[PDB]
Amino acid sequence: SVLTKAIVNADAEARYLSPGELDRIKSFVASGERRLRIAQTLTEARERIVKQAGDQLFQKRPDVVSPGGNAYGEKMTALCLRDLDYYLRLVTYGIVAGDVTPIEEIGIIGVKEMYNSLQTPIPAVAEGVRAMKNVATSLLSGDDAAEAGFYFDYLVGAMQ
């Protein structure tokens, strides 16, 4: 969270929180209510976002759902969609936290290694997240979308 980040910086410096830092905390708590609504919207639309993004991804990458490809077969396709769902849940967590750290610990550290063992292509996963972003953006209002976009972009950056 924003607050955790501020505390951690203070502890490293071995000092009490600066007034400026305190002010940023105040701003964050005010913003939180708006953030909660943005997260709520995505949660409600979650099922459709995943479905739409999946279809887009498969159109963008025929190979992944091909007999050679990792995604191919019912079991495999379900797992690919489950992964997309996981990432969406992480994004919602991020928005409420106001920081990518929650997202980062659960999803972005060791991701390369996990997928390499699975043999899933990382770029395809990134495309899926991009696809989810586009769907999510449409449902969100413009300013809400921008906030959500940042978290989505981070994920795409992480999986690169």
Amino acid at 73: G
Give Cα separations from 37 to 44, 46, 95 (angstroms).
Answer: 11, 14, 10
Please state the φ and ψ torsions of residue 16, each to the nearest 5 degrees. -70, 155
How far is it, in rounded angstroms, from Cα 3 to Cα 97? Answer: 9
Question: Are 56 and 100 a contacting pair, CB within 8 Å?
Answer: no
Site string for a copy of itself, 82-111 (x = CB under 8 A): ----------------xxx-----------
How far is it, in rounded angstroms, from Cα 139 to Cα 66? Answer: 31
C-beta closer to ligand CYC: residue 98 or 107? 107
Site string for ligand CYC, 91-120 (x = CB under 6 A): ---------------xx------x---x-x
Binding site for another protein (CB under 8 A): 1, 3-4, 6-8, 10-12, 14-17, 19, 22, 25-26, 28-30, 32-33, 36, 39-40, 43, 46-47, 50, 74, 78-79, 81-82, 84-86, 89, 92-93, 96-98, 101-102, 105-111, 113-114, 117-119, 150, 153-154, 156-157, 160
Touching ligand CYC, residues 21-80 (CB under 6 A): 64, 70-71, 76, 79-80
Shortest Cβ 142–ligand CYC spacing (Å): 27
Sign of CA dihedral 155, 77, 56, 51: negative
How far is it, in rounded angstroms, from Cα 53 to Cα 68? Answer: 22
Binding of a copy of itself at residue 115 (CB under 8 A)?
Answer: no
Q: Please report where in the chains the tokens 């967590």 appear, as a residue.
A: 93
Residue ranges in contact with a copy of itself by CB under 8 A: 2, 5, 18-20, 24, 27, 98-100, 150-151, 154
